[PDB]
């Protein structure tokens, strides 16, 4: 289904590589995701970066391979509760969803695509969108990040 | 024993002093056979006490195996009055380094037999059983113990061989052959196995044919007992020539089976009769 | 010593001594050079002498011998050399232990096991049934069975 | 090598206090170092004459306090101990008269030993 | 691997793992990885996977191993083949083996408990009530004479067993033969002057197996009904050897964990204790410590596994495979640790009539002893008369007794 | 003070959030004196919280010096200075500095001070020779661009 | 208890714990209770406490013990007394024994390792280089035997038997032993350098273990394998005594360490296991691989040198003396390629048993071996293997196309 890698406590000891994504929220809505800077210019030495647009919120994510692969068009969406967004089971915790707007076109039947739901923002299977003939989406979910816990 | 594909071949001795015994068994070994067999009732009678016979047969096996390269052996007999003396003879057989040993499970009882098998496991010497009483409790159709039960329990206790006997009913014999050598048998009234006797990866036991046969019946046996078997049996030339004749005949039959020559149909013609030391075979084969 | 008085037989233009040179690196097709070893010990050699010189356990030597035998028996029998090719690409387990006496049984079992591709005791798996002909000397049920195809004779 | 009057012995070392007198014409440190090195034979495996003292008594009588590396001695014997210590050191000729006065066994070489069979308390109870 | 459309042959081995993978690992992949790296037709099979009831990221995995991978009757082999290295994994965040399904085959091959419950319950002429045993609180520094004195005291009060302490096996202040001889003289003098068959556990957790055999030989010659041995700290090999010896000579065999807490302490790793209990009923032992009860479900579970002859799966209490036993005798459980008499009604209900109790003293040892040797009748008498215990126990225990026996004052303490 | 390529997964010991406000050298001490000191990852969303908003944000992977900084974290862009254009230009730079460790105590340790134009890095001993017992930040690491070759 | 003002008498026993209390129990009481759970003077005095470096709600405890309180010459008694049921303390979240200091006096009591580094190295005449060995990857006797012959004549020094393969219905230890003795004799005769195969002597009983060891001697095997942790320390010490009595090299195998020490909230860190094992007996010892590598190198230097100084960073706690009790040989527990050959030699010194392809077996063997050479040689000449690895293996340098044939296989 959706690839889910959970951030864990104590992971701050030695990250060799890390990536940065702008942050959008369920309350902020689809408009914020359109507003977020897509191209982050890497003029980096050990990371120095500039963004095409100024953005208030930034999440620092480890260079997990799916997140690293995205590059441009990478965004993180904050959800207060996991259950509403996740088609499957949830444990009642805040959810971070990484989405690639570059692949927003629905071509992957099993692929999950962030879309604007009537209630708010939801992750929808591609096949389901194809059944409703929705050719485009906000972003294609690449990874779901779960919070550190005890 | 470094012997693959082919079955193993066993000589018997026609009859003696112990020196005569050694020379004779060395002849019937070097001629190109695998095993030799002591007679059915030669253990300790006042001709060949165990110690002299054992020593001499061991020397003969050594000499022959050396001067022929391949590996050979003799079914030394240890069916002893008491138990601890059986163990004495077994130890002595080990000291010389013989790899096989006989026993008579009925006439010596399953108890001592199991002890011998367990001792073998530790000392690594192939135990070779020999019925020597079965006919008292099987042959009567309507009474007794059918032999296949004895075979089953014997493979359950000990033994790396078993004198199944000649074949020319045969259906029952082939059946219980499958019953001991395999490791899973489906019930088959016709073949004569009643219950789907499992075996839980316990090793098999080579069935052995014995007596009442000769080289002229070589193919059928190889055909019936397949490959994993111990085929066993004077000659108009002497022991060594007839021995080598048996060897080369069995070899030709194996070659032909692999070659896919129908043995049961061609058994009378497959014989060498020219070429591969048919002189040593002598093509004696008089009826 | 060095008698080998027992059975002794009494690429067609090789030498005598260095024949084993064709076998250390095995620069030939798998199952054609087994009769080469046959002719090698035709002069009176034995696999115990060949193990420590070539690097082929006696089991593998007899395997190669019977495999060359089967490839020969099938080369002069049927078209579709792929069958024989299905052997030349290794995998001799499909052909070992020819109990099936005649040649028709040979080609039948060969093509069937090629069709179904059951190694790891599959050869005997089929043989134990094919050699158990569907008459068993006049049993009940020989009227609606085949006898040459293992699919309808198993 | 010779008399080394600063080798304050490590705990794990073994110690021996000899009481001797030298042949005429030989000073102290000479005889002491001779005593030590004689029972010896890296230089890690040699004794050291870590102390010499004149007997506060009559005359020509000296205590020699010597160390010994633990490794020389066996794991369970007193025989190796005696052979090492008083093996041939008395056979020396530069000594008018020698007498082994006292030994100190470090606890490392005592834990392994089997001690007495029952000791005081167990034997009284029995 | 992972063929879940499959069933295990009724003479295979089964294992019930509970695990949790790393981020971005599909559960099926992890299960098949377990089955593979734990071992043709000899491969394991990850024949079932499911997620835990209610909790997050943590799956049960039922893996069926073929019988022919196992030495005929070797607990240590079973262990070092199943849990050899599978814990040494990368994709598996955590892993905890919680059950084993020993089949009918490879069960009839173990020696088993050296005497079983019925036989020894016949030997020690005691019936109905559960056996009673107190330990020796004066753990260390004790003199040999003092030890003989104290143990005879603690016996004559009416106790069934005097549990020697654990860390004491041989010291420079106490030597085996000395303490052996003395406690033996004491138990003899007691038995002779009270009219019962009493026994004292003795520790033989020796350094080297040879010394273990030597001390067991002595413990027999002197005349003893039981000895004590700690398996995890001496390893299943030594334990099986001692069990074989104890089946040779007429001696019981008492076990005691003294290590388990390192293997089972948390709910995501290690081996749950019921697997150790099963393996220990296989290898050798009669008595086995099984914690206390003041989580009871798992406790009753791995009690039944050690005391009965047929159990069904019953995932509730904590068993995962219906485990038969082919009449291999059952072992006796030991309720031990922090036990005031205030629990007499509880234990005698939880652990049933058939178990043993351990006790870690108003004005001495004989008085506290004989005190303790009440409600092993009184409360037992009440139960066999029909009495709520788990919710009426305080009534009977000297509040319906009111007996000059010193347990009155002893009970009024708490 | 290590110099590390931005390179992925060299050491395998973990993966998590760290952030530094970025300054340009041309900006000078004023930007450093104003960048937010406390950058606190929390809640469960883990979106980082800064006591004050900053224009440019860069993160330095949690290598050991970066993790050690905590408060006072800053990143300084530095730009070169080629006499000959054909001679290859030196790469752009970034300095991870602990503003909390402003005081100059280590002679070996480099410290961030102000050049005539832009900012500069000076040895602690040199700063003490010049009688400056204070610096803006203490450099904890050096830069180098992601090289795939 | 808890007297945090105490000088440990240099012949006491010391223990270094790492624990986490419960919400309400102070750390000092925690350490007091921990030390007390061992039991006048026969009480463990919790001589020190401190918090760990950075983490929350977790502290190091430093306990002392009188040395006499322990058995004169055991390991199992040490473990029973030191770690008996302290973990069962219901008033503690978790803890994990991180190290033990053995006083020199206690170290004297054990036989120690049977043979040791130098004695072993001499028995095989293999000097100035690590000792290479592969695990024969599978079958019946004869195939296994000829396979050992192939993968051994190819220059490998040691061949390992698979851990789960000791005795089975389809594999009887008698046969494995017979055939491997034959193969080793033939190969050592052909090549000349003393070759070696491990032989898994693990037994349901103890008499069985001794019987198998006796057989493995009679054949003429130099070295035998034996798991320790699953087979317990008693059997292990007995086997060590017997090895010293019969002159055989004893090779250990963790085979369950991953159930104890994989996590750092319970268990006993592999340091204490290594120390205890050296105490009881063992020549070689599996110690994982290296690709925290600092901790691994640390306790490797621990179980080998005769005097190790305290280093929290490397992962040690107490200056542990040895009294010239010999050392053991660490083992690179597989999981490596020829490409990783040089770096290994960089760190594991000259004294290490390294363990481990198309073109058949023996070419892989000689490839691995010649890879081992010319790396140890190169470092003897003076290089930086970490910087030159690909070049030290530039090609089949002065060698036939086999190691080269396997180098390009790095893709």
Which residues of chain E have a CB within 8 Å of the CB of B201? 67-68
Residue F97: count of CB within 10 angstroms of its CB: 29
Q: Is C138 on the interface with B (CB under 8 A)?
A: no
Resolution of the structure, angstroms: 4.1
**Integer Cα distance of G159 and G198 in angstroms:** 6
- In angstroms and rounded to an integer, the radius of gyration of the C-alpha atoms of chain E is 23
**Integer Cα distance of F80 and C4 in angstroms:** 89
The closest of B102, B72, B77, B75 to B8, measured between CA atoms, is B72
The closest of E140, E156, E213 to E189, measured between CA atoms, is E156
How many H helices and E strands in chain C? Answer: 7, 0
Q: Among the residues of G155-206, which ranges form H helices?
A: 173-191
Which one of the listed residues G251, G253, G257, G340 is annotated catalytic?
G253
Q: Is D125 on the interface with E (CB under 8 A)?
A: yes
Question: Are B201 and E68 in contact (CB < 8 Å)?
Answer: yes
Domains along the sequence of chain E with CATH: 1-110 (3.30.70.150), 111-414 (3.20.20.110)
DSSP G9: P
Q: Distance between the two ends of chain B, CA-based, in angstroms?
A: 35
**Integer Cα distance of C144 and D78 in angstroms:** 95
Question: Are E271 and G259 in contact (CB < 8 Å)?
Answer: yes
- In angstroms and rounded to an integer, the radius of gyration of the C-alpha atoms of chain A is 15
CA nearest to D105 within chain G:
G105
The closest of E331, E317, E320 to E275, measured between CA atoms, is E320
Q: List residues of chain G with CB under 8 Å from any CB of chain D.
A: 10-11, 67, 72-73, 104-106, 108-109, 323-324
Q: Is G192 on the interface with B (CB under 8 A)?
A: no
**Integer Cα distance of B15 and G83 in angstroms:** 75
The closest of B38, B70, B41, B40 to B57, measured between CA atoms, is B38
Best residue of B120, B124, B202, B204 to probe chain G, by most G CBs closer than 10 Å: B124
**Integer Cα distance of B200 and E67 in angstroms:** 9
Residue B271: count of CB within 10 angstroms of its CB: 21
**Sign of the four-CA dihedral E205, E211, E212, E214:** negative
Collapse the DSSP code of E162 into the 3-class scheme (helix H, G, I; strand E, B; otherwise coil) and give the result: strand
- Read out DSSP for A92-150? S--EEEEEEGGG-S---SS-EEEEE-SSSEEEEEHHHHHHTT----SEEEEEEEE----
Say what the alpha-carbon torsion angle G25, G26, G27, G31 is, to the nearest 10 degrees. Answer: -70
The answer to whether the CB of E49 falls within 8 A of the CB of E4 is yes
Between chain D and chain G, are at least 3 CB pairs below 8 A? yes
Which residues of chain E have a CB within 8 Å of the CB of A66? 24
Question: Are B201 and E105 in contact (CB < 8 Å)?
Answer: no
**Integer Cα distance of C35 and C65 in angstroms:** 7
C-alpha distances in Å from residue D107, one per residue of D68, D82, G68, G77, G326: 14, 18, 11, 21, 20
Collapse the DSSP code of E131 into the 3-class scheme (helix H, G, I; strand E, B; otherwise coil) and give the result: strand
Establish whether B12 is an annotated binding residue: yes
Which residues of chain E have a CB within 8 Å of the CB of B184? none
The answer to whether the CB of A127 falls within 8 A of the CB of A134 is no
Residue E97: count of CB within 10 angstroms of its CB: 24
**Sign of the four-CA dihedral E91, E96, E99, E103:** positive
DSSP strands (E only) in E101-244: 131-135, 161-163, 228-229
**Integer Cα distance of G105 and D111 in angstroms:** 7
Alpha carbon of C89: minimum distance to chain G alpha carbons (Å): 16
C-alpha distances in Å from residue B137, one per residue of B144, B150, B193: 5, 10, 19
CA B196 to chain centre: 28
DSSP G321: E
**Integer Cα distance of A125 and E189 in angstroms:** 83
C-alpha distances in Å from residue G85, one per residue of A133, G23, G88, G183, G408: 65, 21, 5, 49, 55
**Integer Cα distance of G353 and G133 in angstroms:** 7
Which residues of chain C have a CB within 8 Å of the CB of G143? 57, 59
- Read out DSSP for B68-136? TSS--EEEB----SSHHHHHHHHHHHHHHT--EEEE-HHHH-HHHHHHHHHHHHHH--EEEE--SSGGG
Question: Are E143 and D118 in contact (CB < 8 Å)?
Answer: no
Between chain C and chain G, are at least 3 CB pairs below 8 A? yes
Angle (CA) D34 D40 D45, round 5°: 125
Which residues of chain G have a CB within 8 Å of the CB of E241? 205-207
Q: Is B169 on the interface with C (CB under 8 A)?
A: no
**Sign of the four-CA dihedral F65, F67, F72, F76:** positive
The answer to whether the CB of A137 falls within 8 A of the CB of A129 is yes
The answer to whether the CB of F48 falls within 8 A of the CB of F40 is yes
Say what the alpha-carbon torsion angle E292, E297, E302, E307 is, to the nearest 10 degrees. Answer: 90
Establish whether G143 is an annotated binding residue: no
Alpha carbon of F131: minimum distance to chain A alpha carbons (Å): 32
The minimal CB distance from C9 to the residues B31, B257, B276 is found for: B276
Question: Are A3 and E24 in contact (CB < 8 Å)?
Answer: yes
Which one of the listed residues G9, G108, G137, G307 is annotated catalytic?
G137
C-alpha distances in Å from residue F133, one per residue of F102, F123, F128, F137: 9, 12, 6, 12
Establish whether G197 is an annotated binding residue: no
Best residue of D69, D111, D115, D119 to probe chain G, by most G CBs closer than 10 Å: D111
Cβ-based neighbours of B62, under 8 Å, separated by 6 or more: B97
**Integer Cα distance of G402 and G409 in angstroms:** 11
C-alpha distances in Å from residue A7, one per residue of A143, F18, G292: 12, 13, 21
Breaks in chain C after residues, C-to-N cutoff 2.5 Å? 10
**Sign of the four-CA dihedral E337, E339, E343, E344:** positive
Question: What size, in residues, is chain C?
Answer: 154
The answer to whether the CB of E293 falls within 8 A of the CB of E333 is no
The answer to whether the CB of A91 falls within 8 A of the CB of A106 is no
DSSP C79: S
Which residues of chain G have a CB within 8 Å of the CB of B200? 169
The answer to whether the CB of G340 falls within 8 A of the CB of G393 is no
Collapse the DSSP code of E358 into the 3-class scheme (helix H, G, I; strand E, B; otherwise coil) and give the result: strand
Which of the listed CATH numbers 3.30.70.150, 3.10.20.30, 3.40.50.2000, 3.90.550.10 matches domain D1-113? 3.30.70.150
**Integer Cα distance of A70 and E410 in angstroms:** 74
Give the residue numbers of E annotated as catalytic, written as ranges. Answer: 137, 256
DSSP E174: B
Q: Distance between the two ends of chain G, CA-based, in angstroms?
A: 61
**Integer Cα distance of A117 and A131 in angstroms:** 16
Alpha carbon of A3: minimum distance to chain F alpha carbons (Å): 17
The closest of G204, G175, G256 to E71, measured between CA atoms, is G204
Cβ-based neighbours of A25, under 8 Å, separated by 6 or more: A32, A57, A77, A78, A79
Establish whether G265 is an annotated binding residue: no
The closest of E363, E344, E358 to E406, measured between CA atoms, is E363
Establish whether B74 is an annotated binding residue: no
**Integer Cα distance of E64 and E99 in angstroms:** 12
**Sign of the four-CA dihedral C50, C55, C58, C64:** negative
Chain A residues 36-65 with a CB less than 8 Å from chain F: 42-50, 54, 56-64
Alpha carbon of E392: minimum distance to chain G alpha carbons (Å): 28
The answer to whether the CB of B47 falls within 8 A of the CB of B17 is yes
C-alpha distances in Å from residue G318, one per residue of G8, G53, G314: 12, 18, 12
Counting the structural domains of chain B, the total is: 1
Establish whether E188 is an annotated binding residue: no
Cβ-based neighbours of E7, under 8 Å, separated by 6 or more: E47
**Integer Cα distance of B100 and E283 in angstroms:** 36
The answer to whether the CB of G109 falls within 8 A of the CB of D76 is no
**Integer Cα distance of G98 and G106 in angstroms:** 19
**Integer Cα distance of F28 and F68 in angstroms:** 24
Chain C residues 100-129 with a CB less than 8 Å from chain B: 100-103, 106
Q: Structural domain of residue B3, as residue ranges?
A: 1-287
**Integer Cα distance of G275 and G302 in angstroms:** 8
CA A133 to chain centre: 23
Cβ-based neighbours of E196, under 8 Å, separated by 6 or more: E125, E126
Question: Are C51 and G142 in contact (CB < 8 Å)?
Answer: no
Question: Are C57 and G150 in contact (CB < 8 Å)?
Answer: no
How many Cα atoms within 13 Å fall on the side-chain side of residue C150?
Answer: 24
**Integer Cα distance of G31 and G48 in angstroms:** 8
The closest of E149, E291, E286 to E226, measured between CA atoms, is E286
Which one of the listed residues B72, B128, B130, B161 is annotated catalytic?
B130
Establish whether E185 is an annotated binding residue: no
Going by their DSSP bridges, the two strands G13-20 and F137-139 should be labelled as unpaired
Residue C117: count of CB within 10 angstroms of its CB: 10
> Which residues is G285 bridged to in the sheet?
G330
CA B52 to chain centre: 24
The answer to whether the CB of E252 falls within 8 A of the CB of E225 is yes
Secondary structure element (H or E) that encloses residue F36, with its range: none
Collapse the DSSP code of D72 into the 3-class scheme (helix H, G, I; strand E, B; otherwise coil) and give the result: helix
Residue D38's Cβ-count burial label (10 Å; 0-12, 13-18, 19+) is middle
Alpha carbon of E152: minimum distance to chain B alpha carbons (Å): 48
**Integer Cα distance of G159 and G176 in angstroms:** 13
- In angstroms and rounded to an integer, the radius of gyration of the C-alpha atoms of chain G is 23
In the annotation, is G337 catalytic? no
CA E79 to chain centre: 18
C-alpha distances in Å from residue B71, one per residue of B128, C57, D9, E68: 17, 16, 70, 32
Question: Are B67 and C73 in contact (CB < 8 Å)?
Answer: no
**Integer Cα distance of G49 and G58 in angstroms:** 11
Cβ-based neighbours of G217, under 8 Å, separated by 6 or more: G246, G248
| Helix, strand, coil percentages, rounded to 5, for chain C | 50, 0, 50
The answer to whether the CB of F67 falls within 8 A of the CB of F19 is no
Alpha carbon of C55: minimum distance to chain B alpha carbons (Å): 15
**Integer Cα distance of G289 and B61 in angstroms:** 53
Which residues of chain E have a CB within 8 Å of the CB of B200? 11, 67, 105
Collapse the DSSP code of E376 into the 3-class scheme (helix H, G, I; strand E, B; otherwise coil) and give the result: coil
> Which residues is F142 bridged to in the sheet?
F3
Pick left, alpha or beta for residue E142 (phi over 0 → left; psi -120 to 50 → alpha; otherwise beta). Answer: beta
DSSP D86: H
Q: Is E23 on the interface with A (CB under 8 A)?
A: yes
Secondary structure element (H or E) that encloses residue E202, with its range: none
**Integer Cα distance of E302 and E290 in angstroms:** 8
- Read out DSSP for E379-397? HHHHHTT----TTTHHHHT
Task: Output b/e per residue, B230-261; b: 16+ Cβ within 10 A.
Answer: bbbbebebebbbbbbbbbbbbbbbbbbbbbbb
C-alpha distances in Å from residue F69, one per residue of C34, C43, E74, F39: 74, 84, 56, 11
The closest of A33, A16, A129, A134 to A79, measured between CA atoms, is A33
**Integer Cα distance of D67 and D44 in angstroms:** 11
Alpha carbon of G285: minimum distance to chain D alpha carbons (Å): 25
The minimal CB distance from G235 to the residues E80, E233, E238 is found for: E238
The answer to whether the CB of E18 falls within 8 A of the CB of E35 is no
Say what the alpha-carbon torsion angle B159, B160, B165, B170 is, to the nearest 10 degrees. Answer: 100
Collapse the DSSP code of F112 into the 3-class scheme (helix H, G, I; strand E, B; otherwise coil) and give the result: strand
Pick left, alpha or beta for residue C26 (phi over 0 → left; psi -120 to 50 → alpha; otherwise beta). Answer: left
The answer to whether the CB of E146 falls within 8 A of the CB of E178 is no
Residue G133's Cβ-count burial label (10 Å; 0-12, 13-18, 19+) is buried
C-alpha distances in Å from residue F135, one per residue of A146, F71, F112, G135: 41, 16, 6, 60
**Sign of the four-CA dihedral G87, G92, G93, G98:** negative
DSSP strands (E only) in G229-348: 249-253, 284-286, 307-308, 320-321, 329-332
**Integer Cα distance of G163 and G258 in angstroms:** 14
Secondary structure element (H or E) that encloses residue G328, with its range: none
Cβ-based neighbours of C19, under 8 Å, separated by 6 or more: C36, C40
State phi, psi for G129 to the nearest 5 degrees.
-170, 155
**Integer Cα distance of G188 and E155 in angstroms:** 66
C-alpha distances in Å from residue F121, one per residue of B6, E380, F105, F115, F140: 87, 86, 15, 8, 12
- Read out DSSP for G219-253? HT-SEEEEE-STT-HHHHHHHHHHHHHHT-EEEEE
CATH number, domain of B144, equals: 3.20.20.110
């Amino acid at each position: 289904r959706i690839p889910v890698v959970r951030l864990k406590f104590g992971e701050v000891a030695e990250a060799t590589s890390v990536v940065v994504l702008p942050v959008c929220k369920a309350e902020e809505g689809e408009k914020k995701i359109l507003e977020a800077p897509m191209e982050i210019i890497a003029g980096g030495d050990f990371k120095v970066v500039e963004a095409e647009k100024g953005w208030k919120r930034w999440v620092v994510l480890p260079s997990w391979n799916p997140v690293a692969a995205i590059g441009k068009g990478g965004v993180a969406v904050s959800f207060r509760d996991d259950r509403k967004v996740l088609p499957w089971d949830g444990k009642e915790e805040p959810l971070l969803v990484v989405a690639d707007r570059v692949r927003n076109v629905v071509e992957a039947d099993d692929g999950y695509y962030l879309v604007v739901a009537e209630n708010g923002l939801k992750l929808e299977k591609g096949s389901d969108l194809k059944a409703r003939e929705v050719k485009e989406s906000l972003g294609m979910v690449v990874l779901v990040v779960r919070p550190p816990r005890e | 024993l470094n012997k693959y594909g082919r079955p193993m071949l066993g000589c018997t001795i026609k009859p003696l002093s112990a020196k005569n015994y050694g020379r004779a068994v060395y002849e019937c070994l070097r001629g190109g056979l695998d095993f030799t067999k002591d007679d059915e009732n030669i253990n300790s009678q006042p001709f060949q006490r165990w110690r002299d016979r054992f020593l001499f047969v061991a020397d003969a096996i050594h000499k022959s195996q050396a001067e022929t390269g391949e590996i050979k052996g003799h079914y030394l007999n240890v069916t002893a009055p008491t138990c601890e003396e059986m163990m004495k003879r077994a130890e002595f057989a080990k000291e010389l380094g013989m790899p096989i040993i006989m026993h008579d499970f009925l006439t010596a009882g399953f108890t001592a037999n199991t002890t011998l098998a367990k001792w073998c496991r530790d000392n690594g010497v192939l135990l070779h059983i020999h019925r020597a009483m079965h006919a008292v409790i099987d042959r009567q159709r309507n009474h007794g113990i059918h032999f296949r039960v004895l075979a089953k329990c014997l493979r359950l206790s000990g033994g790396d061989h078993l004198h199944s006997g000649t074949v020319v009913d045969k259906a029952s014999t082939l059946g219980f052959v499958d019953l001991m050598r395999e490791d899973h048998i489906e019930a088959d009234r016709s073949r004569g196995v009643f219950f789907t006797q499992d075996w839980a990866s316990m090793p098999g036991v080579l069935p052995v044919a014995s007596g009442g046969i000769h080289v002229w019946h070589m193919p059928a046996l190889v055909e019936i007992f397949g490959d994993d078997s111990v085929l066993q049996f004077g000659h108009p030339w002497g022991n060594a020539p007839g021995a080598t004749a048996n060897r080369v005949a069995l070899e030709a039959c194996v070659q032909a089976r692999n070659e896919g020559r129908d043995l049961y149909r061609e058994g009378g013609d497959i014989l060498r009769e020219a070429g591969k030391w048919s002189p040593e075979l002598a093509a004696a084969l008089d009826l | 010593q060095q008698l080998y008085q027992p059975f002794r037989p009494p690429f067609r233009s090789l030498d005598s001594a260095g024949k084993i040179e064709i076998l250390a690196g095995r620069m030939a097709l798998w199952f054609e050079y087994a009769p080469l070893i046959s002719s090698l010990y035709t002069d009176g050699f034995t696999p115990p002498t060949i193990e420590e010189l070539t690097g082929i356990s006696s089991i593998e030597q007899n395997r190669l011998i019977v495999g060359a035998q089967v490839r020969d028996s099938i080369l002069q029998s049927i078209h579709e050399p792929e069958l024989i090719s299905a052997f030349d690409t290794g995998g001799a387990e499909l052909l070992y232990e020819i109990r099936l006496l005649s040649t028709t049984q040979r080609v039948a079992a060969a093509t069937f096991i090629i069709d179904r591709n059951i190694d790891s005791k599959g050869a005997q798996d089929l043989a134990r049934a094919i050699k158990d002909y569907p008459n068993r000397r006049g049993d009940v049920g020989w009227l609606d069975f085949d006898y040459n195809l293992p699919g309808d004779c198993l | 090598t010779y008399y080394t009057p600063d080798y304050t012995p490590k705990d794990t070392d073994l110690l021996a206090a000899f009481r001797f007198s030298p042949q005429p014409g030989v000073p102290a440190d000479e005889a002491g170092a001779a005593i030590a090195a004689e029972s010896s034979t890296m230089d890690r495996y040699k004794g050291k004459c870590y102390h010499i003292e004149p007997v506060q008594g009559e005359e020509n009588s000296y205590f020699a306090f010597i160390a010994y590396p633990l490794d020389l001695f066996e794991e369970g014997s007193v025989t190796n101990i005696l052979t090492s210590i008083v093996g041939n050191v008395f056979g020396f000729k530069a000594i008018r008269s020698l007498r082994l006065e006292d030994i100190r066994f470090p606890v490392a070489l005592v834990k392994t030993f089997q001690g007495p069979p029952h000791g005081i308390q167990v034997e009284r109870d029995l | 691997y992972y063929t879940p459309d499959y069933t295990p042959k009724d003479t295979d081995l089964l294992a019930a793992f509970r695990f949790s993978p790393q981020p971005g690992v599909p559960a099926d992949e992890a299960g098949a990885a377990i089955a593979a790296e734990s071992s043709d037709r000899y491969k394991g099979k990850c024949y079932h996977i499911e997620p835990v009831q209610g909790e997050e990221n943590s799956y049960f995995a039922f893996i069926a191993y073929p019988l022919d991978l196992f030495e005929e009757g070797s607990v240590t082999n079973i262990l070092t083949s199943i849990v050899g290295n599978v814990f040494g994994f990368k994709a598996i965040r955590s892993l905890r083996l919680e059950d084993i399904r020993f089949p009918v085959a490879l069960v009839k091959t173990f020696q088993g408990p050296p005497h079983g419950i019925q036989v020894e319950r016949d030997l020690l002429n005691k019936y109905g009530r559960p056996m009673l045993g107190c330990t020796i609180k004066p753990k260390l520094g004790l003199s040999a004479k003092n030890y003989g004195r104290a143990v005879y005291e603690c016996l004559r009060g009416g106790l069934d067993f005097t549990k020697d302490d654990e860390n004491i096996n041989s010291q420079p202040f106490q030597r085996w033969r000395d303490r052996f001889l003395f406690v033996a003289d004491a138990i003899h003098k007691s038995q002779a002057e009270t009219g019962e068959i009493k026994g004292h556990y003795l520790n033989v957790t020796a350094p080297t197996c040879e010394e273990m055999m030597k001390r067991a030989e002595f413990a027999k010659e002197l005349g003893m009904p039981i000895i004590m041995h700690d398996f995890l700290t001496a390893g299943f090999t030594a334990n099986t050897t001692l069990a074989k010896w104890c089946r040779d000579n007429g001696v019981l065999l008492h076990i005691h964990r003294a290590m388990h807490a390192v293997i089972d302490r948390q709910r995501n790793h290690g081996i749950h204790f019921r697997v150790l209990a099963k393996c220990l009923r296989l290898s050798g032992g009669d008595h086995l410590h099984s914690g206390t009860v003041v989580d009871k479900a798992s406790t009753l579970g791995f009690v039944d596994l050690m005391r009965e002859d047929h159990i069904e799966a019953d995932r509730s209490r904590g068993v995962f495979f219906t485990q038969d036993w082919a009449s291999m005798p059952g072992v006796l459980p030991v309720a031990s640790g922090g036990i005031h008499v205030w629990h007499m009604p509880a234990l005698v209900e939880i652990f049933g009539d058939d178990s043993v109790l351990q006790f870690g003293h108003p004005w001495g040892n004989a008085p506290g002893a004989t005190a303790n040797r009440v409600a092993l009748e009184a409360c037992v008498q009440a139960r066999n008369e029909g009495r709520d215990l788990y919710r009426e126990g305080g009534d009977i225990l000297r509040e319906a007794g009111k007996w000059s026996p010193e347990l009155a004052a002893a009970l009024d303490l708490w």
